[PDB]
């Protein structure tokens, strides 16, 4: 089997991407944030505290003939941005672009934190990291990909995110028309539960490529590119007037600047992020100070290859018995 679904930016800045998911019988369609850096599938629901729902589409398990409460199971998650959610758990039928899993754990939110309430475009998360990070207690649950894996033609999914445009998630096959050149595969460590790999270096604009190992995670759920402070300083030094602002929370730059590209290494291959991909616009409406798309990972504890980097590539999440990651230019 295979599946394919279109993923769409939530706004004009690519602040996140949403993908339609069918849940239950008859189907209930929710727009979820596919997140290769977490492992819970959770949704806004008829159980969510009413004051914490503001425009999201909700899952109502009592209207689904295939929903069954998973007795005694609860879940509670806290994310890297300080947001959180928690609730109870049903099993139900879940499909993504034609690919169906029966008995998927659907974690129904009873509480969500303010940043989820305030974002009316995201109805939940669909985690695609390793199931070792799933938070369901006392019986841990599997991700949608882990449940589908054995049925798929090949045990893979791919991410092809667009810059200011829609893109595609495919399950079970590699679309060889979607990239240029060849796919370079690189080794993965699953010890922390993430798609964790090692980049071979970087360059700023047309400058000299620096060979240096950069450990980090491939994360569709993170908007920006978070890298070591030495690397990020080298980038922004090439933008006149750019500086790190403690009060805003990162590097900002004059909106009048033209940004250089940023290249990262995958083995001997090279992925080029165009400068325009690194512009996230005015810090507040009407401001001439703009927020940068490359930021320091200091204080996170981990480097994160988020959407700013992933949308410049065709990315293969290979879930063979020894997982790997593949990157191609496009
Ligand atoms: C709800 C999603 C988006 C949560 N984030 C992305 C996730 O992939 C996030 C990535 C991450 C991993 C490790 C350390 C720090 C961050 N994983 C995460 O925290 O995993 C926890 C829960 C399970 O085990 C560990 S985010 O980083 O908070 C974020 C928030 C807002 C924006 N605009 C962009 C990113």
Swiss-Prot record:
Entry's EC annotation: 3.4.23.22
Domain Peptidase A1 residues, every copy: 17-328
Key words of the record: Aspartyl protease, Disulfide bond, Hydrolase, Protease, Signal, Zymogen
Reactions mediated catalytically: Hydrolysis of proteins with specificity similar to that of pepsin A, prefers hydrophobic residues at P1 and P1', but does not cleave 14-Ala-|-Leu-15 in the B chain of insulin or Z-Glu-Tyr. Clots milk
Enzymatic class: hydrolase
GO molecular function: aspartic-type endopeptidase activity
Disulfide topology: 255-290
Record family assignment: Belongs to the peptidase A1 family.
Protein name as it appears in the record: Endothiapepsin
Organism annotation: Cryphonectria parasitica
Lineage: Eukaryota, Fungi, Dikarya, Ascomycota, Pezizomycotina
């Amino acid at each position: 089997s295979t599946g394919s679904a279109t993923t769409t930016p939530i706004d004009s800045l690519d602040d996140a991407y949403i993908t339609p998911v069918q849940i239950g019988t008859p189907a209930q369609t929710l727009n979820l944030d596919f997140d290769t850096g977490s492992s819970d599938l959770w949704v806004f629901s008829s159980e969510t505290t009413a004051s914490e729902v503001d425009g999201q589409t909700i899952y109502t398990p009592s209207k689904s003939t295939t929903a069954k409460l998973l007795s005694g199971a609860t879940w509670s998650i806290s994310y890297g941005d300080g947001s959180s959610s928690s609730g109870d758990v049903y099993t139900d039928t879940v499909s993504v672009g034609g690919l169906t899993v029966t008995g998927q754990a659907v974690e129904s939110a009873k509480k969500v934190s303010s940043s989820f309430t305030e974002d009316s475009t995201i109805d939940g998360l669909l985690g695609l990291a390793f199931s070792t990070l799933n938070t369901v207690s006392p019986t841990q649950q599997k991700t949608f990909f882990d449940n589908a894996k054995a049925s798929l033609d090949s045990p893979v999914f791919t991410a092809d995110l667009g810059y200011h445009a829609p893109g595609t998630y495919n399950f079970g096959f590699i679309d060889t028309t979607a990239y240029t050149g060849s796919i370079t595969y690189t080794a993965v460590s699953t010890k922390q539960g993430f798609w964790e790999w090692t980049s071979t270096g970087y360059a700023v604009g047309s400058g000299t490529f620096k060979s240096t190992s950069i450990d980090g995670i491939a994360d569709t759920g993170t908007t920006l590119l978070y890298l070591p402070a030495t690397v990020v300083s080298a980038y922004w030094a090439q933008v006149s007037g750019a500086k790190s602002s403690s009060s805003v929370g990162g590097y900002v730059f004059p909106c009048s600047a033209t940004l250089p590209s940023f290249t990262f290494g995958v083995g001997s291959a090279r992925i080029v992020i165009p400068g325009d991909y690194i512009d996230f616009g005015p810090i507040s409406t009407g401001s001439s100070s703009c927020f940068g798309g490359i930021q320091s990972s200091a204080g996170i504890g981990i480097n994160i290859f988020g959407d700013v980097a992933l949308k410049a590539a065709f990315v293969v999440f290979n879930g063979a018995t020894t997982p790997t990651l593949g990157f191609a230019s496009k």
